[PDB]
């Protein structure tokens, strides 16, 4: 659908069979989800944001549903302020910015 | 215009008489610009995200042109790693997320 930005663009996602709320973030290269138990193999990496760097678990080829749309790709799991859906998955659901 | 998300959604902006490149960020509530000697009154505040918080100067009623689109609002100035256009200004230029 078309989403305006007067409020945070929050949507419901399904990951690991569990429902969560996440923010569609065009300023995020990657997708970062709060700590959780997620089925799959992972590797430790570090990512950066506005305030600095944090340690996260990188999971590849993870099936995730975003607002009813299917995506399968890399999901980083760690101590993020909020769940964010980044460009790696926004492109998969065909999201674009328009004005 | 329509901006795909294959790469970072960077656009040219004009602020304080200077042209800069900025990232259209739907995951940012506010607008944060790289350290610049903007004239006028300001208030010190703290903003955060991945990695923690940073100290910025809050300026009200700052004129800013985003990809040819004029806007006026609150602009934060500080040691941000990237110039970020947040929702406070994205709404003014009528930007939406579409999928
Ligand atoms: C005016 C009052 C402000 C009050 C103040 N508000 C805030 O701090 C609000 C919540 N912060 C935000 O909205 C901030 C942006 C700053 C801002 O707008 O203020 N948003 C953010 O920080 C969001 C995530 C988030 C969202 C909501 C809450 C918390 C965090 N991240 C935005 C960020 C943009 C990037 C260009 C710096 N992206 C990222 O951090 C992603 N990282 C990346 O994409 C990295 N690969 C980038 C390269 C690494 N660095 C480098 N090369 N130098 C990450 C999510 C995988 C407060 N609450 O204290």
């Amino acid at each position: 659908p078309q989403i305006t930005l007067w409020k945070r663009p929050l949507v419901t996602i399904k990951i690991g069979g569990q429902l969560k709320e996440a923010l569609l973030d065009t300023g995020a290269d990657d997708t970062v989800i709060e700590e959780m138990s997620l089925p799959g193999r992972w590797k430790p990496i570090m990512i950066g944001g506005i305030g600095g760097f944090i340690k996260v678990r990188q999971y590849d080829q993870i099936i995730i549903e975003i607002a009813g749309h299917k995506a399968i790709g890399t999901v980083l799991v760690g101590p993020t302020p909020v769940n964010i859906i980044g460009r790696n998955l926004l492109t998969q659901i065909g999201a674009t910015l328009n004005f």
Side-chain angles (χ1 to χ4, degrees), chain A residues 1-98:
Chain A
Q2 173 164 263
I3 302 169
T4 58
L5 303 160
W6 299 101
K7 76 163 248 65
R8 289 187 181 184
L10 293 167
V11 299
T12 292
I13 64 169
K14 178 257 91 188
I15 176 170
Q18 187 180 60
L19 300 186
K20 293 180 174 295
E21 180 174 78
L23 179 75
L24 303 184
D25 189 1
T26 57
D29 293 343
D30 316 298
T31 291
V32 198
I33 303 301
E34 66 204 338
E35 263 306 326
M36 70 180 288
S37 294
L38 183 62
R41 138 77 193 181
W42 62 267
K43 73 171 183 179
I45 66 165
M46 281 234 297
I47 60 172
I50 197 66
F53 291 73
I54 64 170
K55 297 177 181 178
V56 296
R57 294 178 175 193
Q58 182 184 333
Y59 289 81
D60 291 334
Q61 310 188 311
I62 296 300
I63 302 177
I64 179 181
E65 180 185 282
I66 305 156
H69 291 76
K70 186 59 50 59
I72 306 175
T74 300
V75 173
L76 310 186
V77 179
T80 172
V82 306
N83 298 322
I84 67 98
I85 303 306
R87 292 186 301 101
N88 72 308
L89 303 185
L90 291 171
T91 54
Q92 292 202 15
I93 68 172
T96 59
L97 279 170
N98 297 269

